[PDB]
Write a protein that binds this ligand. Structure first.
Ligand SMILES: *[C@H](CCCCCCCC(=O)O)C(=O)C/C=C\CCCCC
Ligand code: NA
Ligand code: NA
Ligand SMILES: [Zn+2]
Ligand SMILES: [Zn+2]
Ligand SMILES: [Zn+2]
Length: 91
C-alpha cells in the first residue's frame, strides 16, 4: 500500500512503457495483482498517485504503451496511466 510496492509489482512493465514490445504476461500479472490489492477508495487513490509519480520518473516514457496497459491486460484500472492523471475523481 506504498509506492515501493506499486513500482515492484509494475517492474515487469518497464520495457513495454519505454517503447519496447508488450505487455508481457508478467506485466499483466503485476497490474492485475495491484488491482486486486487496491480494494478501497483510499487504496485506489494511493496507487493512482504512485503510478502518476512513477510515470513521471521513467526516462523516455512511451505514453501510448503506458496508457494501454489496463485494456491490453483486461484489468479495470479506473483512470488512464500517464504522468498527468487526475487522481482526485476516481469513481
Ligand atoms: C520503478 C521506477 C521509479 C521511478 C521514480 C519514481 C519517483 C516517484 C515520485 O513521486 O517522486 C519502476 O521501475 C516501475 C516500472 C514500471 C511502471 C509502469 C507504469 C507507469 C508508467
Ligand atoms: Na500515458
Ligand atoms: Na478526472
Ligand atoms: Zn503476481
Ligand atoms: Zn514525487
Ligand atoms: Zn476489478
Amino acid at each position: 500500500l506504498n509506492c515501493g510496492q506499486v513500482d515492484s509489482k509494475m517492474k515487469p512493465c518497464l520495457t513495454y512503457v519505454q517503447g519496447g514490445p508488450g505487455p508481457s504476461g508478467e506485466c499483466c500479472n503485476g497490474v492485475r495483482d495491484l488491482h486486486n490489492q487496491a480494494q478501497s477508495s483510499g487504496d485506489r487513490q494511493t496507487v493512482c498517485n504512485c503510478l502518476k509519480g512513477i510515470a513521471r520518473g521513467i526516462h523516455n516514457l512511451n505514453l501510448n504503451n503506458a496508457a494501454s496497459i489496463p485494456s491490453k491486460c483486461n484489468v479495470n484500472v479506473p483512470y488512464t496511466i500517464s504522468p498527468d492523471i487526475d487522481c482526485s475523481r476516481i469513481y
